[PDB]
Amino acid sequence: MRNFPVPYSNELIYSTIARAGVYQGIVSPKQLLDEVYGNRKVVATLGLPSHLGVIARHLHQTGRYAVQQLIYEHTLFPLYAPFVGKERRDEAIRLMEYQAQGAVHLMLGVAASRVKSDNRFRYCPDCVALQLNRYGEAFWQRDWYLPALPYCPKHGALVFFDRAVDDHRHQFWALGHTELLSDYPKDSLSQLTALAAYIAPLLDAPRAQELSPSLEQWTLFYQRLAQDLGLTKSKHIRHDLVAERVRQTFSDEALEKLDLKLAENKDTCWLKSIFRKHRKAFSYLQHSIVWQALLPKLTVIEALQQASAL
Amino acid sequence: GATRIQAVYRDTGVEAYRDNPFIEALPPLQESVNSAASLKSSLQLTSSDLQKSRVIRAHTICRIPDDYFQPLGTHLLLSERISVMIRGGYVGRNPKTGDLQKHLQNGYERVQTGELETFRFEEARSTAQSLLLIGCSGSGKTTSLHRILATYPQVIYHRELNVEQVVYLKIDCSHNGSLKEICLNFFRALDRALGSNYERRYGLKRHGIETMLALMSQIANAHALGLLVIDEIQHLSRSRSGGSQEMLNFFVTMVNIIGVPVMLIGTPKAREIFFGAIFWDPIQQTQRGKPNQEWIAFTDNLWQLQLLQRKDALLSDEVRDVWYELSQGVMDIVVKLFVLAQLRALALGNERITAGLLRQVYQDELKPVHPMLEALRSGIPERIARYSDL
Amino acid sequence: ATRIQAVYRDTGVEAYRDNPFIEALPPLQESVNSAASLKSSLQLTSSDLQKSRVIRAHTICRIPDDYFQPLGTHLLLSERISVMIRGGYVGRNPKTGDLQKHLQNGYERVQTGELETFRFEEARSTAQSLLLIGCSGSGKTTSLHRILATYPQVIYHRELNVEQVVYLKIDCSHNGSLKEICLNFFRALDRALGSNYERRYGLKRHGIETMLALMSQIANAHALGLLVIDEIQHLSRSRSGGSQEMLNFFVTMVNIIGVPVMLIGTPKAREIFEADLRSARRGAGFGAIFWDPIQQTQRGKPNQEWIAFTDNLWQLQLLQRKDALLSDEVRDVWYELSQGVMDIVVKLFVLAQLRALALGNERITAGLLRQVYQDELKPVHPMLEALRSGIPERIARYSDLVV
Ligand SMILES: Nc1ncnc2c1ncn2[C@@H]1O[C@H](COP(=O)(O)OP(=O)(O)OP(=O)(O)O)[C@@H](O)[C@H]1O
Ligand SMILES: Nc1ncnc2c1ncn2[C@@H]1O[C@H](COP(=O)(O)OP(=O)(O)O)[C@@H](O)[C@H]1O
Ligand SMILES: [Mg+2]
Numbered sequence A: 001m002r003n004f005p006v007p008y009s010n011e012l013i014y015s016t017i018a019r020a021g022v023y024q025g026i027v028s029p030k031q032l033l034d035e036v037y038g039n040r041k042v043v044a045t046l047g048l049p050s051h052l053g054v055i056a057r058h059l060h061q062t063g064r065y066a067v068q069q070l071i072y073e074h075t076l077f078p079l080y081a082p083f084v085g086k087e088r089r090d091e092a093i094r095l096m097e098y099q100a101q102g103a104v105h106l107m108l109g110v111a112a113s114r115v116k117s118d119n120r121f122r123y124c125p126d127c128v129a130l131q132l133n134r135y136g137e138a139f140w141q142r143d144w145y146l147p148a149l150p151y152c153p154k155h156g157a158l159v160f161f162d163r164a165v166d167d168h169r170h171q172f173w174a175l176g177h178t179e180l181l182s183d184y185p186k187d188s189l190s191q192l193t194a195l196a197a198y199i200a201p202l203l204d205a206p207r208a209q210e211l212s213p214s215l216e217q218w219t220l221f222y223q224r225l226a227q228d229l230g231l232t233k234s235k236h237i238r239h240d241l242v243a244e245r246v247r248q249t250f251s252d253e254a255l256e257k258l259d260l261k262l263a264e265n266k267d268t269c270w271l272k273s274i275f276r277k278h279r280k281a282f283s284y285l286q287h288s289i290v291w292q293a294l295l296p297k298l299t300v301i302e303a304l305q306q307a308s309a310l
Numbered sequence B: 001g002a003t004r005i006q007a008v009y010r011d012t013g014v015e016a017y018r019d020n021p022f023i024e025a026l027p028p029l030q031e032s033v034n035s036a037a038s039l040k041s042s043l044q045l046t047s048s049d050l051q052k053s054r055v056i057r058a059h060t061i062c063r064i065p066d067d068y069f070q071p072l073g074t075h076l077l078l079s080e081r082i083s084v085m086i087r088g089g090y091v092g093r094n095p096k097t098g099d100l101q102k103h104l105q106n107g108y109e110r111v112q113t114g115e116l117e118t119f120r121f122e123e124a125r126s127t128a129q130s131l132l133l134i135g136c137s138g139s140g141k142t143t144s145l146h147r148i149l150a151t152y153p154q155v156i157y158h159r160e161l162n163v164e165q166v167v168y169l170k171i172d173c174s175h176n177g178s179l180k181e182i183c184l185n186f187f188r189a190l191d192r193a194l195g196s197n198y199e200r201r202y203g204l205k206r207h208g209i210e211t212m213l214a215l216m217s218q219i220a221n222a223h224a225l226g227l228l229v230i231d232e233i234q235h236l237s238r239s240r241s242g243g244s245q246e247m248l249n250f251f252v253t254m255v256n257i258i259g260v261p262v263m264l265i266g267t268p269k270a271r272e273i274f275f276g277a278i279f280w281d282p283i284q285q286t287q288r289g290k291p292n293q294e295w296i297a298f299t300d301n302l303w304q305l306q307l308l309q310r311k312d313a314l315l316s317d318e319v320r321d322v323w324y325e326l327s328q329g330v331m332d333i334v335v336k337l338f339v340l341a342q343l344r345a346l347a348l349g350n351e352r353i354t355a356g357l358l359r360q361v362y363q364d365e366l367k368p369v370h371p372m373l374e375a376l377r378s379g380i381p382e383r384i385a386r387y388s389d390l
Numbered sequence C: 001a002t003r004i005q006a007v008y009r010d011t012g013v014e015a016y017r018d019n020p021f022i023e024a025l026p027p028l029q030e031s032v033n034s035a036a037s038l039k040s041s042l043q044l045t046s047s048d049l050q051k052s053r054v055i056r057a058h059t060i061c062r063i064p065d066d067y068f069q070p071l072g073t074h075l076l077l078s079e080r081i082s083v084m085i086r087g088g089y090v091g092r093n094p095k096t097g098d099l100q101k102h103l104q105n106g107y108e109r110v111q112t113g114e115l116e117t118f119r120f121e122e123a124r125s126t127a128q129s130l131l132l133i134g135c136s137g138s139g140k141t142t143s144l145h146r147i148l149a150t151y152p153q154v155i156y157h158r159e160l161n162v163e164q165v166v167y168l169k170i171d172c173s174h175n176g177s178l179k180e181i182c183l184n185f186f187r188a189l190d191r192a193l194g195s196n197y198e199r200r201y202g203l204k205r206h207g208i209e210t211m212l213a214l215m216s217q218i219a220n221a222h223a224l225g226l227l228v229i230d231e232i233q234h235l236s237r238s239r240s241g242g243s244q245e246m247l248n249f250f251v252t253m254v255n256i257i258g259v260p261v262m263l264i265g266t267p268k269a270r271e272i273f274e275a276d277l278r279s280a281r282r283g284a285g286f287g288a289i290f291w292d293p294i295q296q297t298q299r300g301k302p303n304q305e306w307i308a309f310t311d312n313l314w315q316l317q318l319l320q321r322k323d324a325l326l327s328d329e330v331r332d333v334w335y336e337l338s339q340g341v342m343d344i345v346v347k348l349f350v351l352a353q354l355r356a357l358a359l360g361n362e363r364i365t366a367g368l369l370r371q372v373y374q375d376e377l378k379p380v381h382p383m384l385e386a387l388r389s390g391i392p393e394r395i396a397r398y399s400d401l402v403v
């Protein structure tokens, strides 16, 4: 391919490849896969793509784009890197370069959850207008495609529509403004929008690359934090004050929507397992809820600094 | 195939040419001093290479037709017009403030729906213009377009984007008025100036005529093509059923809607099929009752390239008159006749050019072009109507 | 078809400089001495008189295929071919040095205002074309095969990887077709090299234009020097396309391939190229050569070409009672019954010798020449009689002799 578009600011590489297909009139998806990649057995993935390294080679003449830059800034890697650990993070970075989609997903937690959560395409009414006003195009953006939240960080709600990634597994689709929006009222919960605005700065932060505390670091950090809050009995959890605080911070409808509904009667729970010794890396969203319920005076980067220090 | 010149941006002095990477990276607009000194060329004529053998002195004298060029009055106007229509065709195609991304987005629908008037944006206009060049055969339509378009770098590479701007492209029409062989010469000339494979993937997939008319004009916008030149547009006279008008409708939809400038070249036999037009004519000896200054300069600059040992520096009025009489104004005939006379003089051994020698060379070695020159000599419109292309 | 390993030479012309293609070719012989390598004669026509009657008769019929006498018109043609082969290589210089850095330095200097003007890469102009037109029987193919034989066909270069095919000779099709003269190119590049091309590039899906743009890549992949198309008269009045679908085909073909093109044809084919200024300009690109039969006398004195062509042919006789010196009446009879055409000179001599050998009267006489001409050479009678009359339109009834 003799002319590969540079990704716009804060874009998914899937949209870059789709726009590369648009700019040359390659309607046939097989022809697009042949030209861009060279093999017809690739999967168009949104969030944690593979085969980067032949994408970063098309942009090789542009000095400022390398493999790490696409891995960190134009794929949803910063939402898994701080939590998984060190060796898993390094292995995943090494495997994004090569042609293995399966191994990359296996190394990461919910990437190995083998379910494409809300695989349908999302978009935000107001963001598309701004992008049309400034860039002149409309592209998929990392803010919309949060792992579990169907919500834009700044505006209210993400207006869904039909079609999905898995309907055609070998085709890249690029948004056209002719489907700009449909005017129908939608209101969003305040605390969920607050969570989106709290987790958004983790995407655009250089310090998220090298701050990945280990498992024992996570469990010791949470243990000392719970001791400092004073709700901790001797080697035990109160299991009541924490639930009360998280219920005050986030309502029941929210916990239903993000699929973390509390079961205080059940001994095994997403909140209960954090206090005990950590066995596997928990998702970013559970940690976000814990942080926002316990102490709101520190940002995500400050929390990562405190966790990495000791 | 073509050398990729890395771009460096200058400071243009025009308000409209404000921040375009495409037209702020072209070579600076030259002036009247550089409109008549960046085209001139001549043979070296070293005095050390005049005393050599006959074979060396006869092989080094045949390079005159290829290496000699003298800019006339018309070339200044042609250069200025091409400069204007190649610099003004990018202002409506700004890649910075989202204007080229609005011309490429529309062109995907035309590939999909097959109709070349399905706009998706209405705020993306076109700012290209058109030119038409018509002149007698041998006037210099190609060799004075390969030295006026040769001051531009063709393939440029801008690294702020990833775009590889192709400044100008040249193709020529099919031997008949073919339909799928004008949209294939474009690909065959674009992928030998980039080292790519566009013909093997646009056309080999069994496309229709409409899809190959849309894909051509989409890939001509993926690379910011500045000027498209089509040589010998008279080949569309012998077109297929409807080809003589469908392509001339496309050539007015490309400059008006898609926005790529286009320039057309053809012999006066191509005026029947019809665009600002420029008409070229052979040099006339008399302009206002006195010999033409351009003709005098052309002759007196050609006369200073002579490998004959017994050469005459002074050019006789009789010799000039018989040269014009046997040439009838066409520059190709002028240069070719001079070279042939010089070769025959070297062959005989008499190394001074004479009017009789000129006439003998003409009569013996210009047999096919005889009736056209005689028709132009007679100047009767009835005789001119058949052949001589005037 | 045999690869000759390149051996580089230096020439005195400055425009050629260091060009592998020009410098690997044989050196620049002067045109005067270029007509001393064409000459040949029948080897060992001596001491064979007392051999037999049948061997001495099979050893005469090789006179037409082993005798060549250069004339005055074989200097100009040889010089034009020598200029045309090497002048078409100066543009194609493969051993380019550092061009990227020089061009970029020029671009930066002109963009910063230091250098006022600069010239970037240029495109080579149209290829030189020559048209040779002569009446049939004058030697338009023997001359080419004895002039191009001094140039090795396929030369192999060691530092490069190109098998420089110095020349190529193809012939036109009898249909007048235009896809059968773009395919003789591959079928004649297969008999010079070893690889096959008609299997790959000779399909039926490819049109005439595509077959004209794939005979341009393999025309500079091997640095081909000349393209000779023989018997161009066959293209008039063909059922494939009109008269303006080929007058444009030549223009396009000349404008694409870039290798010099030589066209050999008959005075009937002049009317094809004298139709418009474009085709006559391109066809007479490097002069138009017109060939005529030898005249017995020029101005008021006997010609010195006919005498030199006759008195040397007379020294290949194998009759026992050979005449020592040639007589004026015999020469005049030979000219009157020959009219200057080459094939009605050597053949009229060989046939007369065979007749004199068969009859047993071992002597060549005027009556024997007249008898053999009236008996065996019947089909050549009308056009020779028209030449005797000399009336142009009477000759124009026949379609291959000069009019
Ligand atoms: N102004 C000029 N000064 C010097 N030489 C010239 C000039 N114009 C043309 N020539 C000579 O004329 C030769 C042939 O002319 P050219 O190739 O430009 O013709 P053309 O316009 O392409 O003709 P056609 O009608 O066949 O398309 C060139 O090789 C060049 O040497
Ligand atoms: N200069 C010459 N000297 C001797 N014989 C010649 C000469 N030119 C032609 N011939 C004879 O003419 C015969 C026919 O020539 P040919 O190659 O058929 O020319 P064409 O194809 O133009 O008729 C040849 O056999 C050759 O012997
Ligand atoms: Mg031309």
Ligand SMILES: [Mg+2]
Residues within 6 Å of the ligand: C140, C141
């Ligand atoms: Mg022949």
Ligand SMILES: [Zn+2]
Residues within 6 Å of the ligand: A124, A125, A126, A127, A152, A153, A154, A155
């Ligand atoms: Zn938004």
